[PDB]
Structure 1
Amino acid sequence: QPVAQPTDIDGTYTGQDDGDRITLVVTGTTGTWTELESDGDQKVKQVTFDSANQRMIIGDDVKIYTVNGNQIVVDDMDRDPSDQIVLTK
């Protein structure tokens, strides 16, 4: 039951996940997902966006994403509400 997403979503979205700042840079159908830890280290993962099936892969972890204007909402596959991450550009 995937809802297809807008295909043009270029930009830089930020938000929080477990107190770490997330920065998602999107270009075309790919991007980078960067997690800033409290000590200043960053973890950078490659992202790919599958717009027709509403899937975003970061590194090799599969998420569901939803685009609402400047906001991208990232969910686990089970849609666990406590794992939801909202990013905004």
Structure 2
Amino acid sequence: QPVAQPTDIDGTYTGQDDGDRITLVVTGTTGTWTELESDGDQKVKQVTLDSANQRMIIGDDVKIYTVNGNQIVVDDMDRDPSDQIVLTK
């Protein structure tokens, strides 16, 4: 289904994904997604947040997001739980 998300979720949320530390900074309806690799490099992707349709676009990859207070759960469109990412501020 498509469930509308809260619109005010400014903050800096962190978590882990396939060994990389993820840092999501949300400013309004946009953001940045930063991955910290093993070697210490970082990959930075621009984010847009579609709150009505629950869509998080990271670079050009479409995700689903769910806001639970300080927690943001990020899912693949097929919600493959092997690929779910949990971020917390």
Query: What are the superposed Cα offsets for residues 7-47 of structure 1, whole Å, 9 maximum, x if unpaired?
Result: 00000000000010000000000000000001010000000
How many residues in Structure 1 have an aligned counterpart in Structure 2? Answer: 89
> CA shift at 1:66, angstroms?
0.1
Provide TM-score, normalisation by structure 1.
0.99
Query: What are the superposed Cα offsets for residues 58-88 of structure 1, whole Å, 9 maximum, x if unpaired?
Result: 0000000000000000000000001000000
> CA shift at 1:5, angstroms?
0.1
Identity of aligned residues (%): 99
1:85 match: 85
Provide TM-score, normalisation by structure 2.
0.99
> CA shift at 1:51, angstroms?
0.2
CA distance in 2, matches of 1:70, 1:12: 9
CA distance in 1, matches of 2:38, 2:13: 19
CA RMSD of superposed structures (Å): 0.3
Runs of 4+ in 1 over 2 A off after TM superposition: none
CA distance in 1, matches of 2:51, 2:59: 17
Unaligned runs of 5+ in 1: none
CA distance in 2, matches of 1:5, 1:18: 26
Unaligned runs of 5+ in 2: none
